[PDB]
């Protein structure tokens, strides 16, 4: 279980999940004054048009 955390490019870090958590997520969106991005732990959260990708194959945030 190992995932990295590159909050909005900026700087990529390394933070895996634990305590009953083992799911990586890759969500991002850009709207009128509302662009954000997060890729740490998650999975449930999808819609239409935004960008979302869940993974859990040990180091799958590339």
């Amino acid at each position: 279980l190992e995932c990295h955390n590159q909050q909005s490019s900026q700087t990529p870090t390394t933070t895996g999940c634990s305590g009953g958590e083992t799911n990586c997520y890759k969500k991002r969106w850009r709207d009128h004054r509302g662009y954000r991005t997060e890729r740490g732990c998650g999975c449930p959260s999808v819609k239409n048009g935004i960008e979302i990708n869940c993974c859990t194959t040990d180091r799958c945030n590339n």
Side-chain angles (χ1 to χ4, degrees):
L1 211 159
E2 272 249 51
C3 236
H4 292 182
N5 187 230
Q6 356 181 127
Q7 241 190 287
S8 220
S9 31
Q10 284 306 88
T11 348
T13 40
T14 35
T15 163
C17 254
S18 278
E21 286 205 348
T22 178
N23 271 269
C24 293
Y25 201 47
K26 273 135 297 220
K27 38 153 152 271
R28 161 155 87 175
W29 15 62
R30 49 127 123 190
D31 210 62
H32 195 262
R33 292 190 71 82
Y35 70 99
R36 314 100 126 298
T37 90
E38 180 138 358
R39 35 266 311 290
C41 272
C43 227
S45 156
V46 85
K47 194 206 222 108
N48 245 356
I50 42 159
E51 222 262 19
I52 41 282
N53 253 90
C54 204
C55 216
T56 51
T57 74
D58 309 356
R59 192 200 210 200
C60 188
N61 73 275
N62 303 344

